[PDB]
Design a protein around this ligand. Structure first.
Ligand SMILES: [O-][O-]
Ligand SMILES: [Ca+2]
Ligand SMILES: [Ca+2]
Ligand SMILES: [Ca+2]
Ligand SMILES: [Fe+3]
Ligand SMILES: [Fe+3]
Ligand SMILES: [Fe+3]
Ligand SMILES: [Fe+3]
Lengths: 125, 126
């Protein structure tokens, strides 16, 4: 695994993010954890692909062109902004708006989002 | 059983992961249980590992520790993390850099964490 990759255990639901890479395979419930590759799930891109809005002193990210549902059983668990060697995560809860604001200085940024149902998604400016 | 924000390490291959979503199953790697890296439990110089939090205009500046920790290839602070509310901001570092990070954020209460490749996980709060 490599830094920043997200793995999920399809059996029990554990989901982790890599802070330090290594050669070993992450395992849970007696099976290799699944690498959650961005934008691979067959889902509505207009509801999952993060939309990056540049603002003075940072960025605002909303998932996706169409506000994603934020229901108890279907919501965006978090939004993440990757800039340089920074990884900013904003966890969300059902009922909140599917968006986040990040105060940071960086021209190129990658925005990621995770739907408990539809997986990992990303976009860059 | 993993809980959000916990950090686990495989002492064999060196994989280190942070929990985003908890659950029942135990994390395993290289045929052994991954080790939960509990904060401030390692026997090391607290003045070099416990993060010091400094409030600044529009955020916080965090340094590791009151005495600058080494940033060598074989001994350095791998990252500094700031926790506030449902926010988890991480600044990864590299040998040769200063053992510090600046976070622009609006939060009266914050927890700062740091990880030394040799001496483990450490934290402090304001
Ligand atoms: O449908 O998200
Ligand atoms: Ca993180
Ligand atoms: Ca065990
Ligand atoms: Ca155990
Ligand atoms: Fe391992
Ligand atoms: Fe969805
Ligand atoms: Fe599991
Ligand atoms: Fe150390």
């Amino acid at each position: 695994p490599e830094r920043l990759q997200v793995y999920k255990c399809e059996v029990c639901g554990n989901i982790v993010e890599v802070l330090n890479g290594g050669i070993g395979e992450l395992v849970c419930c007696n099976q290799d954890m699944k690498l959650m590759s961005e934008n691979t799930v067959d889902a509505a891109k207009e509801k999952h692909v993060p939309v990056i809005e540049k603002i003075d002193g940072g960025y605002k990210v909303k998932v996706g062109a169409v506000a994603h549902p934020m229901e108890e059983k279907h919501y965006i668990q978090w939004i993440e902004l990757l800039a340089d060697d920074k990884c900013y995560t904003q966890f969300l809860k059902p009922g909140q708006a599917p968006e986040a604001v990040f105060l940071i200085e960086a021209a190129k940024v990658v925005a990621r989002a995770y739907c408990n149902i539809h997986g990992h998604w990303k976009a860059e400016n």
